[PDB]
Paper text:
GfasPurple has only one molecule in the asymmetric unit, but its crystallographic symmetry expansion also revealed a similar tetrameric arrangement of monomers. Previous work has confirmed that S175T and S61C mutations alone are sufficient to shift the colour of gfasPurple to be the same as that of amilCP. Like other characterized chromoproteins, gfasPurple, amilCP and eforRed contain an sp 2-hybridized N-acylimine in the peptide bond preceding the chromophore, while spisPink is unusual and demonstrates a true sp 3-hybridized trans-peptide bond at this position. It was found that point mutations at the chromophore-binding site in gfasPurple that substitute similar amino acids to those in amilCP and spisPink generate similar colours. We found that coloured variants with mutations of residues that face into the β-barrel were much rarer than those on the protein surface, and all but two of these mutated residues (Tyr116 and Ser761) do not interact directly with the chromophore. The Y116H and S61I mutations obtained also changed the colour of gfasPurple to pink and indigo-purple, respectively. Sanger sequencing revealed that one of them was the single Y116H mutant and the other contained Y116H and E73D, confirming that the Y116H substitution is responsible for this colour change. Interestingly, the corresponding position to Tyr116 in gfasPurple is His120 in spisPink, suggesting that chromophore interactions by histidine in this position may be important for pink pigmentation. Finally, we also made single amino-acid substitutions to disrupt salt-bridge formation (E96D, R149H and R149K), anion–π interactions (E140D) and hydrophobic interactions (F158V) at the a/c interface, with the intent to minimize changes to the surface character. These five mutants also produced colourless colonies.
Author numbering:
A (entry chain A), B (entry chain A): 2 to 61, 65 to 219
C-alpha cells in the first residue's frame, strides 16, 4: 500500500468568517491504521483570528481512521489518486459554514488544500465572543450512495458556563477513482486542542478516529 | 421506586398520514432496568394502512432504557408524575412528521397516549409505496437544556433493493416535575418488527435501548 504505518501531512487552509479573511498552514503526523494523529497549525495571514478556533479544528484528515478488516475503508482505498471532501456545518444560532478539501499524496506525506467559508455568526454569539471550549466526543453516521461516502454528525461545542452550542455536520467524501464501498457504519472521534498560544495563532490538535458497525 | 423490574404498558395512538386517519392500540411489556421491551400493536381504525408501518414503530417508550448508575435517568426519575415527549421527523424527500406523547403510570402499567401527524410523503416514494425494510440500529445524542432532555438522531430506513431512506429525529422529553439532569450522553437502539400479519394490521416490535457516555 502507498499508506505507510507512520505518515505526515501538510495542510494549506484559507477562508473567510463573517467576511474576515485568513490563511493557516499545518504540519501533521499520525498512524493511519491506528486512527491516531496530531497537527500543529500556524495562522499565516489574518491573525489574530477574531473568531473561535474550534470552528476550524475539524477541517485539518480521514486517512487517519482505524477501520476493522471487515469494513471497507473508503478513503484509504482512494490513494494514491486521492479524494476530495465537502462539508456543510449548520449551527443552531443560524451560522452556516461550507468547507472543501482536496487531498493528494507525495511520498510519505499527504497534502490537504482546504477552503473555509463561514457566515451569519451572531456578533454576540459564542464563536465571535470566543466562548467555546472544544467539541464533545462524537459519532459520524456513514453510508455509501452513488460512489460517495456520506457522513452526518450531531456535534456540539462546550461553552464557558456549562451549556452546549449545537452544530449539525453533513460531510461528503469523494474518491477520485472507484473503490469498494462500505455498508452502513459509524466513526467515533475524540478531537481536542492539546496546546495553543495566547491568541490561537499557534494551535496543536490531537484526534482519535475509530470505525465500527453499531454497538 | 414505582418502576418495577418487570412492567407492562398500554398505547393509544391516533393520527394522520397524508390526510389518512388511523388509530392503533398496543400492549407492551419489558424490563425497564435492562432496556428491553416488546409491544404488540393492532390497527383499530383506518386499516389497512396505505403507508409503511416503519414510520410508526418509534412512536410506541423511554422508561425501558438501560442507564448506568453514573448517568442520571431523566425519564425514570419523572415517575410517578410522568412525562411528555415531542418529536420532529424530517425525511430526506421532504416529508415531515410531528409526534407527541403523554405518559403516565397506573400500578405496574405505563399508559401512553400518542398523536401522529405526517405529511408531504411523495405518492411514489418509499413510505406510500411500502418499500421500507426497517430502521438501522442507531444512536441518539442526548443533553439537558432548560430542564428538558433533548435528543437528536441521524436515522435511516433500509429500502427494498439495497438503498437507504434518511430521516433526522429531534426529540424533546419533558418531565412533569424537576429531576436530576444528566450530562451529554448517548442511547444506542435496535428496533425491529419481529412479527406482523399480511397487511400490518397486527405488528409486534422489539426494542433494546442502552445509554452510555461516548465510546
Ligand atoms: Cl499520532
Ligand atoms: Cl455506492
Ligand atoms: Cl501550540
Ligand atoms: Cl422484553
Ligand atoms: Cl437543564
Ligand atoms: Cl403480529
Amino acid at each position: 500500500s502507498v499508506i505507510a504505518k507512520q505518515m505526515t501531512y501538510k495542510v494549506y487552509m484559507s477562508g473567510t468568517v463573517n467576511g474576515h479573511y485568513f490563511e493557516v498552514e499545518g504540519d501533521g503526523k499520525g498512524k493511519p491504521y491506528e486512527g491516531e494523529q496530531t497537527v500543529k497549525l500556524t495562522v499565516t495571514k489574518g491573525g489574530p483570528l477574531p473568531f473561535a478556533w474550534d470552528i476550524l479544528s475539524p477541517q485539518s484528515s480521514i486517512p487517519f481512521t482505524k477501520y476493522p478488516e471487515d469494513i471497507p475503508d473508503y478513503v484509504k482505498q482512494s490513494f494514491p489518486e486521492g479524494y476530495t471532501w465537502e462539508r456543510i456545518m449548520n449551527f443552531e444560532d443560524g451560522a452556516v459554514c461550507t468547507v472543501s478539501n482536496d487531498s493528494s499524496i507525495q511520498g510519505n506525506c499527504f497534502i490537504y488544500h482546504v477552503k473555509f467559508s463561514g457566515l451569519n455568526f451572531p456578533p454576540n454569539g459564542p464563536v465571535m465572543q470566543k466562548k467555546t471550549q472544544g467539541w464533545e466526543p462524537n459519532t459520524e453516521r456513514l453510508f455509501a450512495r452513488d460512489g460517495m461516502l456520506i457522513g452526518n454528525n450531531f456535534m456540539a461545542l462546550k461553552l464557558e458556563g456549562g451549556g452546549h452550542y449545537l452544530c449539525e455536520f453533513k460531510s461528503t467524501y469523494k474518491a477520485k477513482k472507484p473503490v469498494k464501498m462500505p455498508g452502513y457504519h459509524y466513526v467515533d472521534r475524540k478531537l481536542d486542542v492539546t496546546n495553543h498560544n495566547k491568541d490561537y495563532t499557534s494551535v496543536e490538535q490531537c484526534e482519535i478516529s475509530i470505525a465500527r458497525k453499531s454497538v
